[PDB]
Amino acid sequence: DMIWNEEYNKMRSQLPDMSHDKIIENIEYLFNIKILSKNRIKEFWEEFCKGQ
């Protein structure tokens, strides 16, 4: 990513921090009440693979 951004722009010249246990517990809670679903966890994973 760093090398690609660096040379791709050099050729163009003409967060919150909550605990891991609370993360797992809150995703479990929102998964049980269906705010977070398997489509959302997959789509968010796809956008996470595309970067931060």
Partner RNA sequence: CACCUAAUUUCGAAUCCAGCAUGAGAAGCU
Q: Is 42 in the site for another protein (CB under 8 A)?
A: no
Binding mask 6-45 toward RNA (x if CB under 7 A, else -) reads: ----------------------------x--xxxx--x--
Q: Is 21 in the site for another protein (CB under 8 A)?
A: no
The 10 Å Cβ neighbour count of residue 10 is: 8
Distances (CA, A) of 4 to 9, 27, 34, 48: 8, 34, 39, 18
Contact between 1 and 49 (Cβ < 8 Å): no
Q: Is 14 in the site for another protein (CB under 8 A)?
A: yes
Q: Is 2 in the site for another protein (CB under 8 A)?
A: no
